[PDB]
C-alpha cells in the first residue's frame, strides 16, 4: 500500500500541470500502454481510470494520498524505532538500478528479496541481519534503485531509501562494470547522495564502492580501466567471489562502538563470562581455569562491569 500510494501521488503530481492536452489524450487512450491506462497499482492495475485525468479528482486524490503518506511515514518511523534505539550499525546498499544490490543483499545474507533483471524491481527498502567477520552484528538494507535523472515526483517513493541513506553507516555503493561507462552511474548515484546529505545536514557517511557483474564483464581493462578506482571492491555476487573481501572492507570501515577490555572473570562467576561471549566478541581467551584474561570487545554496558575482575594487564 505504501509503494502504491507513493507511486500514485507521483503520477498525479506529474499529471496535474499537464492535464490539458497530454491529459485528455491519455484519458482517451485505452490501449493499455506506458502511461495510457498504465495505472498506479501493479498487475492489471487501474488503466480504465489511470491518474483520474480530472482536476477535481486528481486534487482530491493527491490530498488523500498526502495524508496517507504522512501516516505511512509515522508507521515507518515506529517500525525503524527498534533499530534506531538499538543503535545497531546500519549498512545501506545504494546504487543504480540493476547492478545487483538486491543480489548483493541476498548474497551477504540469506535473504530472498525480489531479484529480477527488469528495472525498478525493488520499490520498498528491505532490511536484514548481517554478521561482520569480527562478529559485530549489523543491519544490511537493500534500497530502491536510482537513475540518471530521477523524476522529482518520486520523492515520496524514494523517501524510504533516502532515510535509510541518512541513517546509514557504510553506504555500500553497488555498480556494475558490464554497462556503458559505469562512471556515469557512479556520478548519478553520488549526486543523489550528495543532495540527500545537503538536505539533511549530516556528515557524509562512508561510501564503500563495490563493483559486480565482473564475471560477466568484458575484462578489456587491465587494472586501471576495468579497475580505474583505487580501492573499489569487486564481487560479482552470482559466482561466489570477492564477497569475503567486501565483508572485510565493511567491517573495517564500520567504526566499532564497543571497547576492548582485559577482564579476568573468575570461574565462580560463569554468567559474567557467558554473557561476555554472548554480547561481545571474544578472542585470545586464556584456557587457564584460574583468573582468565579475556580480550573481548564488549559493548558499553558490559564495559562497566570490569572493576569486578579487570586487574591491570
Amino acid at each position: 500500500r505504501e509503494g502504491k500510494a507513493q507511486v500514485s501521488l507521483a503520477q498525479m503530481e506529474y499529471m496535474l500541470p499537464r492535464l490539458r492536452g497530454w491529459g485528455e489524450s491519455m484519458s482517451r487512450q485505452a490501449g493499455g500502454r506506458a502511461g495510457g491506462a498504465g495505472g498506479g497499482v501493479g498487475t492489471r492495475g487501474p488503466g480504465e481510470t489511470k491518474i483520474e485525468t480530472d482536476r477535481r479528482r486528481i486534487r482530491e486524490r493527491m490530498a488523500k494520498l498526502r495524508r496517507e503518506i504522512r501516516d505511512m511515514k509515522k508507521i515507518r518511523d515506529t517500525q525503524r524505532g527498534s533499530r534506531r534505539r538499538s543503535e545497531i550499525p546500519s549498512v545501506a546498499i545504494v546504487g543504480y538500478t540493476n547492478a545487483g544490490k538486491s543480489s548483493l543483499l541476498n548474497a551477504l545474507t540469506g535473504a530472498g528479496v525480489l531479484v529480477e533483471n527488469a528495472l525498478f524491481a525493488t520499490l520498498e527498502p528491505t532490511t536484514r541481519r548481517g554478521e561482520f567477520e569480527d562478529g559485530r552484528p549489523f543491519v544490511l538494507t537493500d534500497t530502491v534503485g536510482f537513475v540518471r535523472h530521477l523524476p522529482t515526483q518520486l520523492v515520496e517513493a524514494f523517501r524510504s531509501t533516502l532515510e535509510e541513506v541518512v541513517d546509514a553507516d557504510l553506504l555500500i555503493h553497488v555498480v556494475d562494470g558490464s554497462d556503458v561507462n559505469p562512471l556515469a552511474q557512479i556520478n548519478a548515484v553520488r549526486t543523489v547522495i550528495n543532495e540527500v546529505v545537503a538536505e539533511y545536514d549530516i556528515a557524509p557517511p562512508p561510501e564503500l564502492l563495490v563493483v559486480n557483474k565482473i564475471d560477466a564483464a568484458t575484462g578489456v581493462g587491465l587494472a586501471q580501466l576495468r579497475r580505474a578506482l583505487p580501492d573499489a571492491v569487486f564481487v560479482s555476487a552470482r559466482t561466489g567471489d570477492g564477497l569475503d573481501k567486501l565483508r572485510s572492507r565493511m567491517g573495517e570501515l564500520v567504526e566499532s562502538t564497543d571497547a576492548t577490555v582485559d577482564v579476568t572473570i573468575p570461574y565462580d562467576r560463569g554468567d559474567l563470562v557467558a554473557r561476555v561471549h554472548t554480547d561481545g566478541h571474544v578472542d585470545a581467551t586464556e584456557h587457564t581455569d584460574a583468573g582468565t584474561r579475556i580480550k573481548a570487545r564488549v559493548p558499553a554496558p558490559l564495559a562497566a562491569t570490569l572493576r569486578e575482575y579487570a586487574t591491570f594487564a
Partner: protein, 132 residues
C-alpha cells in the same frame, strides 16, 4: 550432583571443573588433588563422576562406565566425523568387533544380561552413525 564427564587422563580438566565447581564452592586445588588421586591408573578416555555436594564439601566420586558410547569414536579414530548419523555413517567397526569392547567396558551399564547390555551399547553407538 553433577556427572561432569572429564578426561580420564589427568591432563587438564579445566573447562568442565572450573565453572562447575565455581558455584558449588569446591576449591580448585583440593578438587584437582582428589581427581588426581582418583585417576591414578584409570587413564582411559573420559570418566563422569558425581561430586555429591554435601552440606559444605564432599569431594566424592562415582565412576560407572567411563568409555560408554564415546569409546567407539576413539577406537575407530573417526572423531567428530558424523554429521548426519545413520546417513553419513562412519567408523565401520563390525559387531564382532564392538562386542568385545562392550564386554570389556561392561561394569554396571544398568544391565543384568550380556545381550541386554549389547543391545543398549549398539543403540547408543549407532546414534553417531555406525556400521556395526
Amino acid at each position: 550432583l553433577i556427572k561432569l564427564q572429564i578426561q580420564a587422563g589427568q591432563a587438564n580438566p579445566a573447562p568442565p571443573v572450573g565453572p562447575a565447581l565455581g558455584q558449588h564452592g569446591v576449591n580448585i586445588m583440593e578438587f584437582c588433588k582428589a581427581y588426581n588421586a582418583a585417576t591414578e591408573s584409570q587413564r582411559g578416555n573420559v570418566i563422569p563422576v558425581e561430586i555429591t555436594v554435601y552440606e559444605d564439601r564432599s569431594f566424592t566420586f562415582a565412576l560407572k562406565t567411563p568409555p560408554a558410547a564415546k569409546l567407539l569414536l576413539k577406537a575407530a579414530g573417526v572423531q567428530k566425523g558424523s554429521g548426519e548419523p545413520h546417513k553419513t555413517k562412519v567408523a565401520k567397526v563390525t559387531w564382532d568387533q564392538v562386542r568385545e569392547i562392550a564386554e570389556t567396558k561392561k561394569a554396571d551399564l544398568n544391565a543384568n544380561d550380556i545381550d541386554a547390555a549389547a543391545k543398549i551399547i549398539a543403540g547408543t553407538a549407532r546414534s553417531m552413525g555406525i556400521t556395526v
